[PDB]
Write a protein that binds this ligand. Sequence first.
Ligand SMILES: [Ca+2]
Ligand SMILES: [Ca+2]
Ligand SMILES: [Zn+2]
Length: 1287
Amino acid sequence: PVTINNFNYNDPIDNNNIIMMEPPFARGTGRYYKAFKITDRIWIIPERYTFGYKPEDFNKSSGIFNRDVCEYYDPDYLNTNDKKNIFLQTMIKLFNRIKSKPLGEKLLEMIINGIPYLGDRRVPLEEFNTNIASVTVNKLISNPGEVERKKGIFANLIIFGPGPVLNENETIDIGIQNHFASREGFGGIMQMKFCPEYVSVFNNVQENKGASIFNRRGYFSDPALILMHELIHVLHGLYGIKVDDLPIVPNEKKFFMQSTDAIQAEELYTFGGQDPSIITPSTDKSIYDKVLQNFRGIVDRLNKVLVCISDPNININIYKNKFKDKYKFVEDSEGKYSIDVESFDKLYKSLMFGFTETNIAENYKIKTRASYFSDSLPPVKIKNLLDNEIYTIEEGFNISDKDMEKEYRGQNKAINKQAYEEISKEHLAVYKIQMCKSVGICIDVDNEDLFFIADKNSFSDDLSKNERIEYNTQSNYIENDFPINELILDTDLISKIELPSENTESLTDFNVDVPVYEKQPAIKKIFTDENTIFQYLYSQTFPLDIRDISLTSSFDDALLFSNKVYSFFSMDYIKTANKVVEAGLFAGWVKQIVNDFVIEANKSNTMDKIADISLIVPYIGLALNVGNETAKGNFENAFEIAGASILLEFIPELLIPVVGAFLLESYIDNKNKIIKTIDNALTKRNEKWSDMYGLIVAQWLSTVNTQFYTIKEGMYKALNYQAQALEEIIKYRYNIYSEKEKSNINIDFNDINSKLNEGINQAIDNINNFINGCSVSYLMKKMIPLAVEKLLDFDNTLKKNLLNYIDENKLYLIGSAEYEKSKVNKYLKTIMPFDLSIYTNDTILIEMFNKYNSEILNNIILNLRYKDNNLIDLSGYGAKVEVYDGVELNDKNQFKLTSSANSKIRVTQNQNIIFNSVFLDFSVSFWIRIPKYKNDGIQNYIHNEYTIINCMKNNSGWKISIRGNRIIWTLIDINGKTKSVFFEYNIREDISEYINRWFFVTITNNLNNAKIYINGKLESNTDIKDIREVIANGEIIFKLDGDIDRTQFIWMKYFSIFNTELSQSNIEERYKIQSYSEYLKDFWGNPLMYNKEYYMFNAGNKNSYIKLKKDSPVGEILTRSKYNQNSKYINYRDLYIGEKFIIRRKSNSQSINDDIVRKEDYIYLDFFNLNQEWRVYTYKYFKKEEEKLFLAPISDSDEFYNTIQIKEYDEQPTYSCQLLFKKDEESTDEIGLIGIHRFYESGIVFEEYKDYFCISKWYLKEVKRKPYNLKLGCNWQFIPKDEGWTE
Ligand SMILES: [Ca+2]
Ligand SMILES: [Ca+2]
Ligand SMILES: [Zn+2]
């Protein structure tokens, strides 16, 4: 257990627990400090830490000590005895809170028992030397006013009050002659400057501070955790493992990069959480090796220590026993000490990954910041930690009794205001970057607001070094994890070995290095004419002395005029916000503009499924103009083209080393050693893949995810500035009114702000999901593949290396050189899949990753789309696409392959995507339009198979071919085995739903089957279990290849590939998504057009057509003529028959050239009666359910309706459309729909039934039924002449 002593500042000096100490940095001169022993080996000195600081620096100035901290200055803190006593009682309370739980008590016990070794690097191996500044510190015994008598004492930790900056707590170690005992295995007296009252503040991005913008946001820290964070550094220093290694250094070559001190891995380990992931496995092992090496030195010393010359009274055995337990060394029955690898591993991991701020916060239910790399806010002052109504030892601020245990409400600034006070900004100093334009307007930007981007030098290149493989050689993995539960329940973690007495000989050698600190300018002026995130956010603010503003979409005007504020919301939102109205209409207006704000913010949930993008926040570019000029042009378009990369302010140069070669050790005659060597080389190869992935994650987290964090914060600020601007306008407009008018204006300012905040929170959630998806996207598509390339290259080089090794050792292996030759082939075959959870256990990160992987659209490894008269891959993996001259492209994403040699597309796929191995798992989807057979060429049509898409590599791969009315999918494994699955449509149907008409194809492959889906429906299945390895990432050639007629061609659209098997459900959805359009289609599936001749088809009367009756103004319905020749293979009904209709637009006298017909458009349905253009009419006064349509010349009669509204009542994909007659555009008076009706005719000579072109009200209710009745007589399709259909 740990005992926390009690005492008051004014208690008498007793030379035991209350002394006059000579601090280490005093060099044995100057005054002494009244120090109090709060626990064994731990002292508290309630005074300011002045070592290395100028007295005037305690005053707030125009300078700062740290570039990344909102520094609070207060020279009077601790300037009175009573203040000193309050500090003591507070420290006592924090220590009690700390030991209030096993984990904290153990942290304290480890620290108390982790006494520094008696000596350092300069001390001979055979000696203990207590006469050094890192081991002994002096206390003055003699009477006041005379240093005549002093005594020495051993100590582990001395905690002082704060230095100039109150909120800048720090743990300092003792360096002597340029070296640090605490960094070389020995350990040394540790010091700390700490302040319990002025604590840090933080707010989570992915969260919300009570979801109240207009209110105080963020959470304040629990000083006990802040203290335990420093105690962890102390712990590392005491055990001499606070080593220095390759640090994370921020890139600072650009004006938008955040400047900060180099960050050592020990700092990141101390914080825990995701931060250890920023330290590559390479550096993790480097640091581990240095510590182990340090411990080897100490263990050697224990085996050689013979005497303590500095203190004759030191009991050698007592200390050897203590140090043995401190470092967990083992000793044989003779007393010989050695390192036990298992115990060292557990101690090391406990100290580096067990005791972390993150782990401790979780255990104590204390909320803290998500990461070391998170924006720092201004600190707040805790009113009274000594008041149990505000802070207790058991629960800190989160007192369940005050209903503040849940959701850390006790630390919430918006909720627990009685616990703290804001700090006077006058006493705060903040490092700012002044961005001046070459003229000159300047904008100040806090350093914290810039992008933190780790420089390439931050990462180790150890992977490029060679490795010797031997029968010995084993793997090396350091899990940045330690089960906190075993630590808390560990029986031998805490020492039970006697703690040596603290009294010793007074120190006489005061040699020590004393740090010297100095402030630097708080403002750094730079020049740039760029208008990026900082300028854009700035343009959204207004001075405090201005109260009348107006919104504007003009960024430039907003910068120029102080009464102009920039807005990235709609033109309409902006106009309404600037609208001035009468008092009686103000409440109405407030409701309107506020509602508009919510709508605008909610556009953050915009979908873009047709472009294969589920979520897109359209206004991000306009809001920040971050990255590559995202404020210009259409952001959504730019994103579809370049993806996540366009939002990055800077594209990092990644460190991706060529993996070093393996040197296999020769073992002539030894069969086992040789075989073991081979195995060890294989496993070692896996360590390389994993380490490479770890190197990638580290860079992603510190160079890319940091940039996206800045963007998320930027959007939070942007949205808030917008709400604030609207709030400013509303207040102004309201206050222009007189008191009398205001009394009659029904406005609730708190409901308004509530409405706004809610809209903002909803927006922020969408933006968070959007950005995280972008960040993961960049990792998976722009980083991992470049590592895979090097790793694959490594595998190859290693492959020949091993086989050649099994070669030179063929004899010594005998009848086995074959068994292990295949062993090598199959091993270097299956590659390591990337799993983020292996490199971090951070919930937020893991969830981001899993979400990404649960989105089928991220499985797209090829997506050919039209852009600027060219086809390019938008999957994000950068496939090279060569479209040759003979291919015809249009902006409808349709491309045509002809019989010409130059009608071809060459696609070179990305070779670094896990596509192959395990069992063949991928899908291919595309739309296709295949022309009808030439009647006089039916034999060749059904006989000649021709390839259209071929993808082979080493005579293995896949292809899509066509033989007449059959489309074929063929696989060929590495051995030559071939399997096929096909879809064949009928060519004897009166009306085919496939011939020369656009339809959707989807082929999926799993280890068992090959399936072909047509328009979402499964059509064919083939068992492909026998098929082995199938190389599918070779070049893809789009080209008609075979014995084709020179008239043969093929149209294709939306070609894409997925590296997984699509479900029937995914396919049906893709089908509906790619079928969608605002316009109607024609019979062939192309967009319906105005001013284009069309024959009419009726889905309810397939074999019927309309013809103007010779004797009357009606359309009689006749039977379609048919294929007349004698081929047994074909049959169809003629399509180019009946009247030639043409659709004319009703509105805008923009003439009659041509155009796209959209749903709900009002039209005139006309047709050609010889040299005249006639029209389709409906007599206005019929009382029956239906009537024959009236066909006549163009004219305007009050007796006939002439306007038609083209409709689409079907919710599912179809090329049919419906035609409605309404009383007039505005009314909701429906006359009926155009269809076909059967009439009975009985005349003097003929008796029979005849069908006529009609209008019926009966259809009105029918088109509502679900599922949609495709057989309804009101379903029509327009058929224009097409080269793909000849009759
Ligand atoms: Ca690490
Ligand atoms: Ca302005
Ligand atoms: Zn720290």
